[PDB]
Amino acid sequence: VIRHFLRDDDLSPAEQAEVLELAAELKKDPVSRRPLQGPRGVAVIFDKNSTRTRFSFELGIAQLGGHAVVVDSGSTQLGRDETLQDTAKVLSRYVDAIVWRTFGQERLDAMASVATVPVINALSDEFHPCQVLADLQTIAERKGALRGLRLSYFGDGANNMAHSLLLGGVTAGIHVTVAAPEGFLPDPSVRAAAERRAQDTGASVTVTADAHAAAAGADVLVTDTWTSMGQENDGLDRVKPFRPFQLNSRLLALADSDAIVLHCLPAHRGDEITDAVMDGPASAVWDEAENRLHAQKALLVWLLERS
Amino acid sequence: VIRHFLRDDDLSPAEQAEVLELAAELKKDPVSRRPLQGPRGVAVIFDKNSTRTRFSFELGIAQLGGHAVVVDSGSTQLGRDETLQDTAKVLSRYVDAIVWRTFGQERLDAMASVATVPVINALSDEFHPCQVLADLQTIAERKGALRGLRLSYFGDGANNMAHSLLLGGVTAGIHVTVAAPEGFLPDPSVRAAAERRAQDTGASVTVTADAHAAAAGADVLVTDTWTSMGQENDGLDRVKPFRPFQLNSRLLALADSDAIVLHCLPAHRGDEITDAVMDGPASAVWDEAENRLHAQKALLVWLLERS
Amino acid sequence: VIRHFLRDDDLSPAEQAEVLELAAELKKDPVSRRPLQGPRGVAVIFDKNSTRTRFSFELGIAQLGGHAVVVDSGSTQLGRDETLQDTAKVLSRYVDAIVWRTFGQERLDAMASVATVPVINALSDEFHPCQVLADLQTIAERKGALRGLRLSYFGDGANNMAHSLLLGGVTAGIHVTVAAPEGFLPDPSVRAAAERRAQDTGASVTVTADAHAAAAGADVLVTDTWTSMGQENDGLDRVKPFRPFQLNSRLLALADSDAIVLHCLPAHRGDEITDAVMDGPASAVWDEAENRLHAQKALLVWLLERS
Ligand SMILES: CCC[C@H](N)C(=O)O
Ligand SMILES: CCC[C@H](N)C(=O)O
Ligand SMILES: CCC[C@H](N)C(=O)O
Numbered sequence: 014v015i016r017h018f019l020r021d022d023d024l025s026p027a028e029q030a031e032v033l034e035l036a037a038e039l040k041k042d043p044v045s046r047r048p049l050q051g052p053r054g055v056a057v058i059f060d061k062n063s064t065r066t067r068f069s070f071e072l073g074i075a076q077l078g079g080h081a082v083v084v085d086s087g088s089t090q091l092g093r094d095e096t097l098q099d100t101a102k103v104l105s106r107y108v109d110a111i112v113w114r115t116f117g118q119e120r121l122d123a124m125a126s127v128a129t130v131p132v133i134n135a136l137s138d139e140f141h142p143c144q145v146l147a148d149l150q151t152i153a154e155r156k157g158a159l160r161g162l163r164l165s166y167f168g169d170g171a172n173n174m175a176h177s178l179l180l181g182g183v184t185a186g187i188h189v190t191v192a193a194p195e196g197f198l199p200d201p202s203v204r205a206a207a208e209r210r211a212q213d214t215g216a217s218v219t220v221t222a223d224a225h226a227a228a229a230g231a232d233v234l235v236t237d238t239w240t241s242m243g244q245e246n247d248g249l250d251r252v253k254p255f256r257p258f259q260l261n262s263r264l265l266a267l268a269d270s271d272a273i274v275l276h277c278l279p280a281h282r283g284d285e286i287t288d289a290v291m292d293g294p295a296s297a298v299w300d301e302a303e304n305r306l307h308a309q310k311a312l313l314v315w316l317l318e319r320s
Numbered sequence: 321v322i323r324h325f326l327r328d329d330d331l332s333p334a335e336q337a338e339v340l341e342l343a344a345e346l347k348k349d350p351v352s353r354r355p356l357q358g359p360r361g362v363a364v365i366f367d368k369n370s371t372r373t374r375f376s377f378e379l380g381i382a383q384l385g386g387h388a389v390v391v392d393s394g395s396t397q398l399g400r401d402e403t404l405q406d407t408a409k410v411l412s413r414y415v416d417a418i419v420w421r422t423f424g425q426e427r428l429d430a431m432a433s434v435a436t437v438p439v440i441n442a443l444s445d446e447f448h449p450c451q452v453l454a455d456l457q458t459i460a461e462r463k464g465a466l467r468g469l470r471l472s473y474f475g476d477g478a479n480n481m482a483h484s485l486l487l488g489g490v491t492a493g494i495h496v497t498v499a500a501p502e503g504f505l506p507d508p509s510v511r512a513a514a515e516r517r518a519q520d521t522g523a524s525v526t527v528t529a530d531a532h533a534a535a536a537g538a539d540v541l542v543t544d545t546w547t548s549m550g551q552e553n554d555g556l557d558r559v560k561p562f563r564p565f566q567l568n569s570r571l572l573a574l575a576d577s578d579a580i581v582l583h584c585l586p587a588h589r590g591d592e593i594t595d596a597v598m599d600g601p602a603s604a605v606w607d608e609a610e611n612r613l614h615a616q617k618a619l620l621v622w623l624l625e626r627s
Numbered sequence: 628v629i630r631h632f633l634r635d636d637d638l639s640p641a642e643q644a645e646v647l648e649l650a651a652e653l654k655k656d657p658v659s660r661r662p663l664q665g666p667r668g669v670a671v672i673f674d675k676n677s678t679r680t681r682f683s684f685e686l687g688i689a690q691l692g693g694h695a696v697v698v699d700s701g702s703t704q705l706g707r708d709e710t711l712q713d714t715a716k717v718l719s720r721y722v723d724a725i726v727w728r729t730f731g732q733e734r735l736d737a738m739a740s741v742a743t744v745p746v747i748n749a750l751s752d753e754f755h756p757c758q759v760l761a762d763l764q765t766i767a768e769r770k771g772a773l774r775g776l777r778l779s780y781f782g783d784g785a786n787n788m789a790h791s792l793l794l795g796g797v798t799a800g801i802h803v804t805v806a807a808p809e810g811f812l813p814d815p816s817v818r819a820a821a822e823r824r825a826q827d828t829g830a831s832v833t834v835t836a837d838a839h840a841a842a843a844g845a846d847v848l849v850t851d852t853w854t855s856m857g858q859e860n861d862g863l864d865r866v867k868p869f870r871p872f873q874l875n876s877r878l879l880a881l882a883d884s885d886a887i888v889l890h891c892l893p894a895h896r897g898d899e900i901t902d903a904v905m906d907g908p909a910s911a912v913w914d915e916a917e918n919r920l921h922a923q924k925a926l927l928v929w930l931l932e933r934s
Contacts (some may be wrong), residue, residue, distance in 0.1 A: 075694040095586035106610035279709035303720035402893035413917035
């Protein structure tokens with residue numbers, strides 16, 4: 014019955030494609046779709062920091078005719094231990110969708126399990142699915158057909174972006190490669206889900222510790238922070254392992270000539286990515302960030318007309 | 321000139337009836353009254369946690385045509401000791417009403433003493449009058465006439481809910497009973513005010529330490545947390561005295577067969593209310609929370625046309 | 628191309644009069660200009676506490692038909708060290724202007740250097756130009772023309788208000804005097820720029836340690852806090868030096884008989900300004916606060932049609 018979006022494969026390949034096509038339509042006509050007219054509300058809850066997600070969601074919602082109630086969960090009664098399920102049943106009386114940036118996926122599942130409106134993952138510890146929709150809209154407007162392109166991700170292969178690039182990348186027909194060192198590879202379960210979905214789309218999943226091989230011939234190079242939110246006090250050395258995986262000019266010179274570079278941001282310039290690459294001719298980082306707005310609006314128009 | 325809503329008896333019986341009738345009408349047509357179109361502003365200021373108050377005011381104001389400016393007081397100049405009177409005088413220059421969730425009642429009185437727009441209590445240590453209007457709206461849509469109903473509240477009978485249920489209840493013509501251990505009875509001057517208001521409406525006020533007597537034949541049964549915001553560090557055991565006052569199936573079984581159960585939320589499941597009661601057939605808990613939206617809109621409309 | 632408002636002299640004198648003429652028209656017809664209709668977004672970012680700037684900007688954007696995204700910067704990725712240039716380039720994809728209350732002026736220069744939308748100083752350690760636009764509107768509406776009035780500022784002559792009164796005063800043709808102890812004097816390059824602007828408008832700049840001589844004959848007396856945000860820990864006694872500079876009944880008695888008193892707020896009553904003055908017949912303080920709303924809206928309309 015009600016459609017949620019907690020992870021990238023919650024959209025079938027055909028569904029993802031309808032979303033991305035609508036994304037491109039909304040980018041060209043931003044304020045003419047008003048499913049939340051009223052204004053109907055949408056909850057937008059943050060447990061972690063945000064710039065791109067906060068702005069793109071709040072504005073998108075307003076552009077759909079609705080009203081984002083944007084909160085830090087700590088100042089809600091979640092900070093005083095109201096259960097996630099009571100919260101979600103309450104929010105279901107006020108809003109038409111619940112967008113949440115959180116820690117463990119289990120938290121999203123708890124709310125999704127009783128909510129009577131779409132729950133949307135605005136970033137968890139294990140996935141960042143709205144980002145990869147914006148990533149894919151950006152690749153599509155630059156390259157055309159998504160099916161059969163090669164995309165390589167570099168760095169922490171166990172974080173939310175690695176995971177979502179895998180699931181959303183194969184959902185789109187894309188051969189995805191994760192280049193990561195050995196403490197830091199995708200979760201087996203996510204890798205299994207990606208392989209499962211790739212079978213239906215013609216895609217493939219490669220996981221390697223050879224950055225040079227991952228880069229070579231690639232159509233899209235992607236990276237992300239070596240230390241994500243939640244990982245600060247994990248005690249690991251998060252510099253030494255990742256140095257070989259830095260997205261720099263040696264690396265990019267191995268890719269296909271028309272290759273593009275993505276980074277979800279915020280970037281720690283000099284670490285995972287260098288200035289010359291980020292501010293170079295291949296970077297699509299600013300268009301990528303912008304698409305957060307157009308992609309999430311499409312997602313929401315699509316989820317709402319199905320719920 | 322100027323009507324504030326700082327505690328429940330700030331409305332007369334006839335006025336409360338006007339507000340509740342309008343609450344009913346706005347539930348039916350939520351966007352048909354737009355007295356704040358423009359948008360005009362309303363200030364919504366939080367010194368404490370919230371989910372239901374935050375969402376229902378922010379959205380209810382937007383559906384009245386207006387725009388809520390929602391802030392934690394700690395990031396305003398209130399956090400650098402600007403006085404409450406200066407703050408109120410300045411806010412009366414931007415917004416058409418000031419909604420404030422705070423501690424001592426005296427702080428609301430300080431703002432209401434100089435403000436030139438309605439000040440509205442969105443919870444204080446002593447009263448929670450917007451909650452009780454939602455309660456009454458939910459009672460009325462389930463049972464019809466309010467006059468003559470029998471309501472009992474259980475638990476911490478010294479808290480804002482107990483005071484507000486006593487005052488809003490008897491204003492509605494409802495026989496109110498507060499059932500609580502000896503060390504947590506209503507403030508006697510609140511209780512006296514309630515007895516005075518009861519003489520006008522045919523209501524009554526009862527304070528009891530016997531839960532079973534309070535449940536017997538009750539039409540509505542209400543409870544709330546046993547540790548309110550601001551009580552966390554009073555050092556008292558706030559489980560043991562309250563156990564006999566728990567709202568569970570055996571207590572509920574004593575009530576009228578058509579009795580309903582209310583809880584303002586957030587609930588501590590297994591303490592003041594059991595899963596079995598809260599999720600049972602008698603529970604009006606979620607309609608109650610929805611009715612915050614409607615009741616506060618009605619309240620806003622009424623106050624604005626009188627100020 | 629694109630006009631920023633980082634400091635008062637960013638407007639030439641003809642441009643400032645355009646903005647203030649607009650302010651007065653918008654005070655009379657507040658929803659008559661909708662350039663942000665859509666809604667288009669505007670970033671409103673806080674590094675420091677705020678009441679007046681928060682409410683005036685948020686509501687004023689809404690009244691121009693747009694949507695303000697209001698954030699404390701600690702919650703954004705600025706809190707996790709994303710560079711200002713990256714933040715600005717990203718915001719430029721989402722919003723139509725960036726309003727920022729911050730610390731060093733160089734942070735605003737950093738953003739404005741790469742931003743493709745107008746950056747607007749909602750207060751920095753150096754300037755507070757939007758406040759002075761509201762100050763000028765409130766003088767104009769009480770005294771008529773601005774050219775050739777006498778304005779005196781008292782207290783910390785090196786703070787952001789001293790600098791804006793200097794630059795925005797002379798730009799309006801106002802003879803500006805700063806009365807401050809000798810260790811608290813306007814930054815030399817701000818005084819120079821003010822002297823240079825005064826030559827084009829026929830105004831003048833005076834700086835003195837003599838509070839009595841500064842009050843004698845003044846049309847406008849202005850003060851501000853002795854310890855601004857950010858100065859709490861400089862090690863200075865910030866009471867003893869400024870006592871001779873207190874805006875009290877004695878000093879007001881020296882002014883022109885039709886003099887007005889202004890104070891940006893928040894006020895530490897009993898320090899820089901007394902109750903008798905603040906609350907007496909010369910005080911234009913509440914109207915001054917309200918005019919933040921009208922003056923910022925005009926500035927936004929004006930900047931947007933030129934960017
Ligand atoms: C947009 C932030 C993504 C990053 N992997 C994190 O969780 O911090
Ligand atoms: C709505 C919360 C009510 C509770 N008595 C409290 O003040 O915390
Ligand atoms: C509006 C505040 C003005 C003061 N100079 C400060 O910087 O704190």
